[PDB]
């Protein structure tokens, strides 16, 4: 009988299974999950600055629709659009709606820069029963409904603004499409309107079309919303012999400025998390995640797998 000395390693009763290059199921002593699967269920208001659209979506917020007045002067890292948002004003459509939505979301601001305009030869501040504020007729708070001077001509419009400042201005304006020849003349006198908006380097000319569209809020006409950017030093002109839906000023574009919009339905909590999804917030140190392709902020990268175990111990051999 001689002394012996043995070299060995530690083992545990219950191992954890991991994958390797050659094996699907290998039992090791310990492992850590690298795919985040859980989320908070509420959107965390820190550290990202949130603004909840509630019953206004972002464009309605930018136009100034009846439900959107709390949306004034707001700023955000992420604007939240709700599935319950509703239209509340005169029926309108936006050509390349998505791009105006994207440009707004990204500027991260609904702080309107108000301007004085002199619209010579027209009635101003038109209103509609399709856009009610507090029970009374009203209109996009940022747009100016011009009509012919009362009882006379739609004195031709030729107003210009020079961008004297250091930022790019974004102008929201529109065009009224009447439901009949009567409405056209009753409103703009002329039988065919025309709206031309231009800066030195780009330009936008629209002829309204008259006809019936499905009744919305009792209205069969439409307004088409357009937008024009204006660089420092450049000028914009609004030229119209009829049907101009006029601006009351402009928004400030900041560039690629770390903003965005999220379309979620979850309530804003009081939690903290640097990563928001449409499904709630992610609070994790994991590299990957199962929760949503829609992930804003400092997030684990979305993957398809619901589990990826990283081995953090040797093979487990209890027996």
């Amino acid at each position: 009988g001689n002394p012996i000395i043995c070299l060995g390693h530690h083992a545990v009763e219950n191992g954890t299974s991991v994958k390797t290059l050659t094996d699907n199921h290998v039992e090791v002593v310990s492992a850590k999950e690298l795919v985040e699967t859980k989320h908070t269920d509420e959107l965390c208001p820190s550290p990202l600055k949130l603004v909840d659209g509630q019953d206004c979506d972002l464009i309605n917020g930018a136009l100034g629709s009846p439900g959107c007045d709390r949306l004034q002067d707001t700023t955000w890292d992420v604007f939240i659009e709700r599935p319950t948002a509703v239209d509340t004003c005169y029926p309108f459509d936006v050509p390349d709606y998505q791009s105006l939505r994207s440009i707004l979301a990204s500027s991260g601001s609904l702080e309107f820069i108000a301007e004085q305009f002199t619209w010579n030869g027209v009635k101003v501040d038109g209103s509609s029963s399709a856009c009610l504020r507090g029970g009374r007729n009203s209109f996009f708070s940022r747009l100016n409904w011009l009509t012919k001077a009362t009882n006379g001509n739609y004195g031709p419009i030729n107003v210009t603004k020079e961008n004297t400042g250091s930022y790019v201005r974004l102008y929201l304006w529109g065009v009224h499409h009447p439901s009949s020849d009567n409405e056209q003349t009753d409103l703009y006198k002329v039988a065919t309107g025309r709206v031309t908006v231009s800066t030195r380097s780009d330009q936008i000319s629209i002829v309204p079309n008259i006809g019936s569209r499905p009744r919305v809020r009792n209205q069969s006409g439409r307004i088409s919303i357009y937008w024009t950017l204006v660089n420092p030093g450049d000028s914009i002109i609004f030229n119209s012999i009829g049907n101009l839906i006029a601006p009351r000023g402009h928004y400030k574009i900041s560039k690629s400025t770390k903003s965005t919009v999220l379309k979620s339905d979850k309530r804003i909590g009081s939690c903290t998390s640097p990563c928001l999804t449409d499904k709630g917030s992610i609070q994790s140190d994991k590299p990957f995640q199962n929760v949503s392709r829609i992930a804003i902020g400092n997030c684990p990268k979305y993957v398809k797998q619901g589990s990826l175990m990283l081995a953090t111990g040797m093979r487990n051999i209890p027996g």
């Binding site: 002394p3 012996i4 070299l7 060995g8 390693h9 400092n298 797998q305 990283l310 111990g313």
Partner: protein, 172 residues
């Protein structure tokens, strides 16, 4: 594993070894005992922690991107937005699957490796005083009290001291 030590010539692990990852179990005239080896345990842990720190570094921070969900069919542009996103997801899922599998193959080889290094270190301390029993154990061909055992475990064991005793015991 590449070295054949864990799940190899070491028949199994020790559920009782709860204060290290690797260790010594000895039998001598005074009885038996188990102790953890710190160096080997620490080398393993360091490399595993090392690769764990490497994997967490938070480098994915995205704000305005592109829409990824749609309320109406549009055709061309939408097809592109969807395809771009699906391409990206497939490539990241792939990167993730390969990372883990390869981050597991290596880890298990590292742990097997460290087990082997311990064994070999001890093999070299003992010189001609011991013989490999084939199962991770050395037979030590001389009396080895508790102090002598610890001298193996703490790396101060001088094989010259017992060489004549041990060689005589082996060869005859």
């Amino acid at each position: 594993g590449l070295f054949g030590a864990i799940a190899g010539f070491i028949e199994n692990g020790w559920q009782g070894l709860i204060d290290g990852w690797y260790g010594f179990r000895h039998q001598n005239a005074e009885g038996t005992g188990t102790a953890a080896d710190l160096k080997s345990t620490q080398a393993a842990i360091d490399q595993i922690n090392g690769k764990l720190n490497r994997l967490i570094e938070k480098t994915n921070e995205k704000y305005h991107q592109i829409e990824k969900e749609f309320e109406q069919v549009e055709g061309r542009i939408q097809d592109l937005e969807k395809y771009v996103e699906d391409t990206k997801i497939d490539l990241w899922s792939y990167n993730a699957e390969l990372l883990v599998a390869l981050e597991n193959q290596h880890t298990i080889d590292v742990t097997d490796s460290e087990m082997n290094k311990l064994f070999e270190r001890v093999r070299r301390q003992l010189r001609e005083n011991a013989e490999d029993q084939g199962n991770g154990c050395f037979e030590i061909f001389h009396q080895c009290d508790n102090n002598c055992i610890e001298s193996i475990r703490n790396g101060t064991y001088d094989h010259n001291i017992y060489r004549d005793e041990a060689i005589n015991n082996r060869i005859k």
